[PDB]
Fold this protein.
Amino acid sequence: QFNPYGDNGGTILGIAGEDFAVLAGDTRNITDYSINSRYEPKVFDCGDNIVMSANGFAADGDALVKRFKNSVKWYHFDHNDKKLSINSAARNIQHLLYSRRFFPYYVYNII
Amino acid sequence: GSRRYDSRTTIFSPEGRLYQVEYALESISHAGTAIGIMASDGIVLAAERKVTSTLLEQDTSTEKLYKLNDKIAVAVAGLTADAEILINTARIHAQNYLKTYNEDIPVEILVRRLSDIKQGYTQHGGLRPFGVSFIYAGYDDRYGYQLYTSNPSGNYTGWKAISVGANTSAAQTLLQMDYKDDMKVDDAIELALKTLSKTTDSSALTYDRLEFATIRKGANDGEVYQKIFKPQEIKDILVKTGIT
Amino acid sequence: DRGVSTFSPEGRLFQVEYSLEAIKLGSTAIGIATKEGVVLGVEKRATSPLLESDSIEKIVEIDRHIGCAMSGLTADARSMIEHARTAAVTHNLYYDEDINVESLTQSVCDLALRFGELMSRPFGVALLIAGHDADDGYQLFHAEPSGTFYRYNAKAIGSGSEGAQAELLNEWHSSLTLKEAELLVLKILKQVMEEKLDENNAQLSCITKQDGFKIYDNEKTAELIKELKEKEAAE
Amino acid sequence: GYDRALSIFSPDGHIFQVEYALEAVKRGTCAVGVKGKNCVVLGCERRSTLKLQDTRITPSKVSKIDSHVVLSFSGLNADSRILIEKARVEAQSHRLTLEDPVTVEYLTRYVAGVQQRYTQSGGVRPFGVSTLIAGFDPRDDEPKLYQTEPSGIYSSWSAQTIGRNSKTVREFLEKNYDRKEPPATVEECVKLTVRSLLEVVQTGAKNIEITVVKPDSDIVALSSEEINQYVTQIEQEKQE
Amino acid sequence: MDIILGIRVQDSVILASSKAVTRGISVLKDSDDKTRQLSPHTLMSFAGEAGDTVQFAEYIQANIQLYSIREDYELSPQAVSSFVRQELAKSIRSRRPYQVNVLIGGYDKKKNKPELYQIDYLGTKVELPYGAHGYSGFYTFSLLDHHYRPDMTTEEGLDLLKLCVQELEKRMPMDFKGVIVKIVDKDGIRQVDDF
Amino acid sequence: GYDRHITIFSPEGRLYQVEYAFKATNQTNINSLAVRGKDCTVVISQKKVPDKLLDPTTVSYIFCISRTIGMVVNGPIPDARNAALRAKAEAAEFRYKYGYDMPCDVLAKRMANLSQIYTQRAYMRPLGVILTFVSVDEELGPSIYKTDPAGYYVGYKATATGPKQQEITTNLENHFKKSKIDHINEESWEKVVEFAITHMIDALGTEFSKNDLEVGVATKDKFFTLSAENIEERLVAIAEQ
Amino acid sequence: MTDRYSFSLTTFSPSGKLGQIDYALTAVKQGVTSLGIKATNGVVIATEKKSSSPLAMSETLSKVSLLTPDIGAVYSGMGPDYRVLVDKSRKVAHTSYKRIYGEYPPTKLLVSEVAKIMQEATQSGGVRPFGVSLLIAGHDEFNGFSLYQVDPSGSYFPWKATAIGKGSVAAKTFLEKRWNDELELEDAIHIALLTLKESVEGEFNGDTIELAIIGDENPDLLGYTGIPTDKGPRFRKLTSQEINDRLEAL
Amino acid sequence: TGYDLSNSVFSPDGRNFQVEYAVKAVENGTTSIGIKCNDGVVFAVEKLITSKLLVPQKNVKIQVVDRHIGCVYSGLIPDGRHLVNRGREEAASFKKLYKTPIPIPAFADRLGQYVQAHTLYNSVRPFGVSTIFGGVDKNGAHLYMLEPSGSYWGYKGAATGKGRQSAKAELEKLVDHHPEGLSAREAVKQAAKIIYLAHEDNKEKDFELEISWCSLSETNGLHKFVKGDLLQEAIDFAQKEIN
Amino acid sequence: NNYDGDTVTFSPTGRLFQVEYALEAIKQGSVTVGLRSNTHAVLVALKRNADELSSYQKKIIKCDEHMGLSLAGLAPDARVLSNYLRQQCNYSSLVFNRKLAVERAGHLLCDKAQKNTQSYGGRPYGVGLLIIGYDKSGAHLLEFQPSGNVTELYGTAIGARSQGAKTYLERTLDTFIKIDGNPDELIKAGVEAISQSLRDESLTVDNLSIAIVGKDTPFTIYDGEAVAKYI
Ligand SMILES: [Cl-]
């Protein structure tokens, strides 16, 4: 039987400071006991001073980030180049994830 | 495109009338007269076949009086083909009701359903309306004996006595004159035939130019019987009432 | 006959141009934007004295920070208002924030040209959409059935529009207060209305950052009418 | 499907189909609505061109939408059945989803919305019907009376009339109805409703129908004899 | 839910329905009314899967109320029971059937007779002098078979009903938190507030 | 007068669009002829290549519908090819569904029914073509069936179509009045083609070169068209007697 | 593309006339004469094979058609319209009856289905009415022999005998004088040939006349033996020779 | 009258006036030609320089279908593009199912049936273009020309647009003087000349020459644009002949 | 006359009047100018107001980081077409990781507009567009007409009185094409070009709208005090 999911490993870490924030992640990509890549970027600058990382199943992670980056682009078009605040991005991402409630993006996401 | 050839069947005139409904009524006014008379102990349906021939097979023929179920019947005035479309729909509606509630359909509910179908053709779809006027004769345990009429507009009304088709103005005046509330079926039979005999465009009213039916509680004990009259039976009632 | 989406030889859509004629027959609605808020006022125009005038609802809330006044075939506005309210609240669901007045106006105007042979004809109603957001401050928009919307410092729509617009041309300046704007709407409404202006046949409303969108009471408006009469008699 | 745009603007900014639908309402029998201090009365004309009618089974002019709301109309009879059915379905749908019966204002807004939808939808013509919707909101003793028309606009009325010769009976109501002091009792409200119809009706026999609606789902239709007593008393006072 | 009982006596129909509602291992409510008035002289009690019961009952209620307004007339208990049966028989072959068993108690004003109908989720209808759903009948039918007469008064019906509930309370492993009892007769529907 | 624009009845009970589709049939100014032999069915048609820039090999109004069925068309080429594509599709579908080759008369009826629909349904126009189907049927033998824009079709002993159809028709009528048989009593198809060409020459009163004619022949289990050189051999034999 | 004619092409005129139906009846009037006569033990239907060309094989064009083993049909008016109606009539006899009840429909009900199809072409969107009048003869167990006429409107009437098309007015007068309730099938065929001769100009023989009967069961035309209840079709088309034999005793 | 107001209506002549009006739009367009040579085909088109602001060699008119078919047209340019888009879909589905690239006669009928379909209903307008197209397949070289009616034939030479008469006369001379045939490189030179000669009908504005070709020997049976030195050589040959 | 009731009808001379009437809507619209060099491409637009209380209607729309257009005619139709371009630019990026070629963008607009000119019920677009962009083959300028015709140009102008600006660019062709690596001078040439189409009114701070795209310059729009430099 076809299993649409996989586990590409990795680990991410986000810490909020008083006037700054960090989003860190390891660069290793794996399947089972093999290494796919020693350097495969996992944390992305999505625009508007927002950084994002979708950790878990890489294919779903790349799809989600790609869709959120797209959502930022269309937020500028639709709302007169207004800056997408971090709280507004968070809520937007909730709806991106729940659109697949019955066939989920198998990722743990931090922004 | 196609717009060029659209007659626009569902529009108001400047006076607020529906063109096609009015013209459909004009069509119906040339159809054979149909009369319904409601009495205390039953209902009469009488109707005139249009200029027949001697070679028409009358005993197997049916153009005016139709059976919707065991309790309800209709007299037709207008396009027979249009009427049969609606009659078959009404027969199905009555059976749907009986299957759902396990009770025979009340007369008005059946009438309202058919009238709603007629109405729809005047408001949407871009199709011509049904060129048909019905007289509904029926019985149920709520209101007892009932007469209704519906026309292409989809409007329906209840009656003690009523006519549709040709010469309704003259026919309605004659019915309004001789009708009384305490009237019985045998008297109503006579009134119906006398009215047709005076309003008819034909030279004389004969058995071969008539369809006749009664709905009577004259069935053995508390129940209702429909009687579609045979050619020989119409000939006998014409002699009995003293018309031929 | 002819297509509903047909262009005239001058390059205009027949139906859109004809819907504008219907809007000219509508009751007057005026909007004035200031730095203290935006004022919206309308002529109610009851067809009979037995008609309970308070049931005439020509000023309408879209969100807490956006209001709307209408003129023309007012029945057509109900689906536009429903869409606007849905768009405003839906954006709050998706983005956890108030929606920009311009973006709301654009969403309403996207419905405009969705007609053909979608709805069978354009809308026969014009809207004055007034509101406030953090980015562009107090704003007033005029939404037409053409799908076009202009921002305005002040605008009048309806039967007495060109007379009122000429008056708004002279009176408006960038330092107007909210109180001054209120009296100015009442003044111009009184000028173009057929019947004598009072609290029952005219209605005021405003949108401020603090209190949001508010329709004025008949008692509150009555005082502003009395205040207007006295200041006109003062010279 | 049939998508033809029947309701469209004309050069002068009029939708003729909607305006011709108002002419159908003008042709319809007269209907009147008067609200008192603690009630609303709906009066309706019955044209006496149709005798030999069975008044038991003939569709009544006033229709219950729910136990606390009624609807009368003027215009095409067949068209009114479609609005009434839709209204009745919406009333039960509201009770089912919100657990409260509809307010009179909500029901009116829905029926008005249906009428409006039929003025800018393809392949359909407007309803040739204006309605008077009356009743009392749940747990409220304030009377409610609304009017709708083919265009889809609606509004609340202290008293209103629609249909043929409505111009005349509105003239009567405008001078006779006082807002500061409305018909205090049921008698006064019915009397004023019958008086208004007597300006237009012809004979006061079976031509006048009256339906009284009181708070808390108390709706009754007056009989011929009860109405005839009002007709008798009015004319006897008039002979002076 | 669990226990719903019904008994048709001389001049009325009596319906008894349990008050308990359980989620997981906890009894959330002990005063739940498992019934809906379909019309002034027709009452329907219900029992089955969580959620489906109320949704189905309220859907039936809305349809009968709609009919009443349209025709200005109350449908007979027999007509209502047939409508309900068809909806369940329609439902059983659906993508996701409604798992609801009902009892319909009504007083026919035309015939001046009380009527009790038992309908299960498959659309199996039977008219009975007394009825039950689920396991309720296993405990109670022996008592009803013994004590029931068709000429019983409403008071005698209530006494026989108490005996049925007492037997249930003794031999069922299940605490159903007592019953709400309602009577359907010529004057309409009323609840027995002390039972 | 919109009863002349679409296919609805005029007051006279006529369909003018169908009648005007018949007139489009002669727009090409080409005459065709079909006759039956003992073992074969022959169809000949005039070929006119007015422009020198045209590739004459691509100019044709004869179509190979199936292995057994051939079709000649009288009318404009776009409608001709429309009909040809449909007939090919129908013939192939028939064989797939019913397990045997579509008969000539059955295809003719099918195409005639499609034409009838265009005369009744408003949104579809009639095709301005007359279709003559030919084959050697396995049950009926040599067969000629012709369809027109009215949706009419019938079998033929022989037939002719075009501007000068009447002249050809009478010529054929007179021959069959003499012989008193329903076909050309001849063994080889070559001589049946020679008969067809000869009688077209006599009827029209024009001589033909190899490039002036177009010939289609139906035999048992195949239909085929003749090349210019095959036609030349036919013209030589005619001239030598 | 898409069929954008979703509106009726037949509509009521101010006088109450349905123009397209009237015009369809005019097309029927121009059509070749066909007739039907009912006897005590059978029914006969007949028409002229108006050949468009002598080169045309008129045997391949069938104006008289079998609808069921016991029901036949003939027409006057537009031939192509008739051909497609026969296709639909044959199919509806199976789909709406035989596949349900396991037997062929009685004449009146098959007529009713044909009538319905013709009525729908009179009201549905983007179509014209059928330009034919049908005469449908048939037999069934409980109704016996019957003959029906069906018009472009969808209206149908049962006849003892009748004619439609070119010379129907004269032909119906001829039939009124000759018809009685004691006619045998051979007498009806004889009257049919007499009546049809008056409307025909040219050749009058078995090759120019098409004639069929609904009569006795034909076990020779069944195609198989072994089932007693299956006794064969009552519909039979008379041959060219069979017609000519009766033209000598004319 | 009124027969010319709606597409797919037969006039009493048996004519479709809407299609004939579409031809008028074709006759109004710029000149385009096609020449069949020994082992392939050559296409050429007149591009009117409306203004100096037009970027030279950028507004390409000739279009490729698949990799072996060339298409050029005169009339309403957007209608031509629509037709080529369909042609590309037809060619793709053919190759998808049957593997081999679509033969030219097969491709010709696909366009023909599609154009003919737009003469069957009043809900669509006929195509306002005549399209010259062709290429090399397994059976050799083929040249076609397709009209608004859906009518098409095979050609030795083809021409359409405002200067079609002048072009046709020139094409007829080549057919007569070269019965054995014309080479691909010759056909390119001749194509340039004919467009220059046909430009006398559009002599008000100056023009830009655009040529393409498919040849078994010169291009391996693939469609290619004539560029650089070979184009200039053809322009020089053309300019020499007019003087 | 009798052949202008819908877009599906040719006239006897082979003209499509509904398309020509749509073309007329562009001529009524306010003037906008487009011009490019080898490094940059510039749009200049004269915005139009309803009255003194009203704002000035926006003329320029961004489609991607490397592409955008200016409009003249029905503004809502420009919104529909620019939205389509945004989607197509975006489809190319998401699927092929490829910035959409300006020439291909023109071909897509042509095909979208064409479908509206051949079918019954619909209407042609009532707007003209000037598309600028910078892709792998350098700077580009396109002119879109709602007939479907799309043309690649060095410079052009559309709208009311656009002939004056178009003549100026036709004279200046050899000069402005050579303005490489100097965005300000290229804009100056555009502002000087659009000035040839002005009568009575002049270029004010809230009247003028400018956009630019180039080698190391994303598509950016300049309005308000950002264009006071060029007045
Ligand atoms: Cl078929």
Notes: Helices of chain H lie at 17-28, 77-98, 104-117, 164-177, 184-198, 228-242. Chain H touches chain G through four residues (CB under 8 Å). The first helix of chain H runs from residue 17 to 28.
